[PDB]
Amino acid sequence: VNSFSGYLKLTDNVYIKNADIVEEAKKVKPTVVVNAANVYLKHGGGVAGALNKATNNAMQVESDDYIATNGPLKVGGSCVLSGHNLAKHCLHVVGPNVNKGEDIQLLKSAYENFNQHEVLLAPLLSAGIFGADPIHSLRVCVDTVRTNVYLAVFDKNLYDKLVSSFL
Numbered sequence: 001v002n003s004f005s006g007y008l009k010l011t012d013n014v015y016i017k018n019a020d021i022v023e024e025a026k027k028v029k030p031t032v033v034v035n036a037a038n039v040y041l042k043h044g045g046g047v048a049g050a051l052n053k054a055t056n057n058a059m060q061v062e063s064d065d066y067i068a069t070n071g072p073l074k075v076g077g078s079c080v081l082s083g084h085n086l087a088k089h090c091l092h093v094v095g096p097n098v099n100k101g102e103d104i105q106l107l108k109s110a111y112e113n114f115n116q117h118e119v120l121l122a123p124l125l126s127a128g129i130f131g132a133d134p135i136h137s138l139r140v141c142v143d144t145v146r147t148n149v150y151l152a153v154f155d156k157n158l159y160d161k162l163v164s165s166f167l
């Protein structure tokens with residue numbers, strides 16, 4: 001048992017809710033919140049801008065030190081950093097950005113990072129400003145992640161479409 005509340009169960013291990021991931025994280029304080037990161041950990045907008053804003057820019061300060069030491073992430077890759085006031089840890093995962101021409105095939109590799117964590121609160125990778133089809137992202141999530149994932153979908157119209165079209 002865990003404290004995630006109000007989720008619809010899609011599969012044995014995937015759950016979904018119409019929610020603002022920032023407010024969800026602040027309420028639950030999960031072990032892991034997933035950020036929709038880019039390879040530079042520049043948290044300017046979308047989910048990343050919102051998570052970073054909620055940390056009062058502490059996420060960005062930590063991220064800049066990470067990049068200065070390690071260089072950029074790979075598309076499809078991830079790193080574990082602090083969750084600050086939102087979670088114990090933040091798993092920064094880079095899904096392909098279709099608006100940059102990145103290979104959508106890398107979305108499966110991106111979701112594989114979730115399997116290193118038993119339970120996660122996460123957005124749909126490559127959705128939103130990353131330009132992929134969220135219906136597709138949900139399908140890849142369900143067919144790739146084997147650990148327990150609680151998906152937060154900000155947009156109510158999208159949430160309803162994702163549920164109603166789910167196979």
Ligand SMILES: C[C@H]1CCC(=O)N1Nc1ncnc2[nH]c3cc(F)ccc3c12
Nearest residue numbers: 020021046047050127128152153154155
């Ligand atoms: C990933 C895409 C897929 C459909 C959707 O709603 N997306 N975004 C979110 N998903 C969950 N929580 C969020 N909080 C946010 C705060 C922001 F400033 C901007 C975006 C989000 C957001």
Ligand SMILES: [Cl-]
Nearest residue numbers: 046047128129
């Ligand atoms: Cl977004």
